[model samples]
Target: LHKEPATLIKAIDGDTVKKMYKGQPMTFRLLLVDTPEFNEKYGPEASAFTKKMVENAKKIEVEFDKGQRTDKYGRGLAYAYADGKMVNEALVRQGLAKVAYVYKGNNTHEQLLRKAEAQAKKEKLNIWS
Candidate 1:
């Protein structure tokens, strides 16, 4: 993961955010996680959690892998960290998001994310139940 220092502008939703990366405005789609849309079940909770994480962090950053740079919608594909903790994993661990859009060997945290999601699923947390 080649991490790039970024500053959060807004938590667009649970799995999407607007941040400044190297003087460029970027719409970052959190890697390998799919959070519910605003109208979906548990959507409010997911958004609240993401907002709280980004807002309370002392520093924010984004990580990128070699596989892809941007999605079809022009959003940057990245894993965002808040104060060194990965926000994407947190979402999955808490059942606010699901492991999704996975590409083989694209993300370094695939196993870690899978483990987290498995635990969440087993526990029947939030969306998993």
Candidate 2:
């Protein structure tokens, strides 16, 4: 499924945003990840990076593993894939985020995510200077 494209409405802390996702209103929890709290270490840069990546981008592919799909907050816990790549993993690989491990879905997406993070760490993409 795809969340309807919307502008950045609010920045909750630094790692999260309460924006209009899909035709229905929902928050886009930059999945499987956490970034520096607002205004902390590269926080603005991280948010800017996400905004740039998402701006004008429509049709995000939502994929999920299994079990407890939505968090307690009712936000769908899913991997937002765009252009054949996992957005969450991409962020982490870019050094903009780290996996939060909210669900033990035991899916291969997590495995792929690990590999991405490894590659990013090795290549020092985004923030590892």
Candidate 3:
């Protein structure tokens, strides 16, 4: 895990965030999961949830897989952690997201995310309902 200390600057959406990394502005997308679009049905709720997470965080960290650092959009693909909880996994656990894109070797959290999605679906929580 290539971990770095970051200060969350903004929430672009449920899965996208802006942060200051190494004194530079960087945008990152939550890895291993996908949330509703900003204009879609539950999009606003998802974005609000992410915003709350960022605002309540005492500290945030970004973790990346060695070789797969960025996505095609130039946003860094990472697992963001706030107050010791993995935000990507948290989204799935809360039923606001699902296991989506997984880069082959870079998917360390695959099983965990999938399991969370399954539980969320089974419980019919949030978007799953």
Candidate 4:
């Protein structure tokens, strides 16, 4: 009803995290539709892998009922609800090039995440927009 059954396999140290939940496999880690991003960009994304995957979204449910909106890169960051629902702080580190600037999943995923991040604007340690 609220959350989905989740099983994380292996997370890309660079944010390409994968988990199988609700009868489907999920790569929690995603790219913004950027290719100029090479390996360094990849590693940069690993900013908060453990927090987002293991800790925060502990009571997990992918808000992605919004359906996946993959791109030329064939990737998208599915915002799963953690405990409640985090705006995905890591997206901050990743940059707009990946998550889309003007618009992408602006309705379900974007709207949910946007509010989360904007108001959650208060940082825990040292992360934010």
**Candidate 2 lDDT (Cα, whole model)?**
0.62
Q: Scored by Cα lDDT, where does model 4 land? A: 0.44
The TM-score values for the models, in the order shown, are 0.95, 0.73, 0.95, 0.49
Q: 10, model 3: CA deviation in Å?
A: 0.9
Tens-place lDDT digits, model 2, residues 62-107: 5555555566787656565555556677677888776666555525
- Candidate that beats the other on lDDT, 3 or 4, i.e. the better one: 3
Residue 40 lDDT (model 2): 77
- Model 2 worst lDDT run, 10 consecutive residues: 1-10
Sort the predicted structures by TM-score, highest score first: 1, 3, 2, 4
Clashing pairs in 3: none
Candidate 1: which pairs clash?
none
Off by over 4 Å in 2: 1-22
Error of 3 at 87 (Å): 0.6
lDDT of each: 0.92, 0.62, 0.89, 0.44
Q: What value does the lDDT take at residue 25 in candidate 2?
A: 57
> Total clashing residue pairs per candidate?
0, 1, 0, 2
Please list the residue runs of candidate 3 whose C-alpha ends up more than 4 Å from where it truly belongs after superposition: none
Better of 2 and 4 by TM-score: 2
**lDDT score, candidate 2, position 50:** 62
